[PDB]
Amino acid sequence: HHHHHHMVHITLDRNTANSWLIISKDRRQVRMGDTHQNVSDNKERFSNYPMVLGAQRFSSGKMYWEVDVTQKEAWDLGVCRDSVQRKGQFSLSPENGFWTIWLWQDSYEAGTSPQTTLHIQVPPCQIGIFVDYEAGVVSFYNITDHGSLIYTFSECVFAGPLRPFFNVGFNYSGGNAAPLKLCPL
Numbered sequence: 001h002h003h004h005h006h007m008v009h010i011t012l013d014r015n016t017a018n019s020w021l022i023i024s025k026d027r028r029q030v031r032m033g034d035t036h037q038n039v040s041d042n043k044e045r046f047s048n049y050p051m052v053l054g055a056q057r058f059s060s061g062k063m064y065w066e067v068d069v070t071q072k073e074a075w076d077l078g079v080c081r082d083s084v085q086r087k088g089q090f091s092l093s094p095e096n097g098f099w100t101i102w103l104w105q106d107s108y109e110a111g112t113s114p115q116t117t118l119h120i121q122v123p124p125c126q127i128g129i130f131v132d133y134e135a136g137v138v139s140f141y142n143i144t145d146h147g148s149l150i151y152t153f154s155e156c157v158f159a160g161p162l163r164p165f166f167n168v169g170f171n172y173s174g175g176n177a178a179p180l181k182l183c184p185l
């Protein structure tokens with residue numbers, strides 16, 4: 001792909017984070033803590049899952065960023081509407097305002113309803129995410145495999161401003177403590 005020139009500097013929004021997440025000083029890394037991180041509750045925080053939003057809101061144009069997923073066993077990445085549900089249980093689907101892929105139990109899937117199997121020969125250490133607001137496109141790229149395409153959501157109905165979306169995943173196994181990191185431009 002040749003989307004690199006639409007690169008945007010994403011930072012994480014502390015106020016949206018699940019209360020167990022630890023966001024770095026530079027707001028570019030997030031990991032699961034082993035306990036509640038001693039923050040007050042608010043209506044923005046994802047309550048049920050280890051999720052956080054980027055601070056940036058996008059309503060037009062083309063945007064590209066990269067995320068490091070090295071040594072994680074489970075995670076979700078993509079974009080979502082600014083008005084997604086924060087409290088209780090929900091599925092990741094375009095009907096609910098999410099355009100995402102994930103790793104779970106040694107398989108990669110796109111968050112369609114129902115979910116779609118992805119075909120990845122080279123397990124990615126870094127994922128590229130491309131959004132074309134006007135075209136209604138969200139695409140995912142395998143940076144470890146020379147930028148190969150992972151998945152394209154097309155005919156997207158965003159229906160609002162978009163925010164970068166992250167889930168570091170639970171760490172029941174002791175094998176998923178590693179952070180998600182926003183990679184430099």
Ligand SMILES: CCC(=O)Nc1nc(C)cs1
Pocket residue numbers: 094095153154155156157158
């Ligand atoms: C990826 C295409 C898409 O956005 N489909 C949607 N389904 C509904 C029903 C809302 S958005």
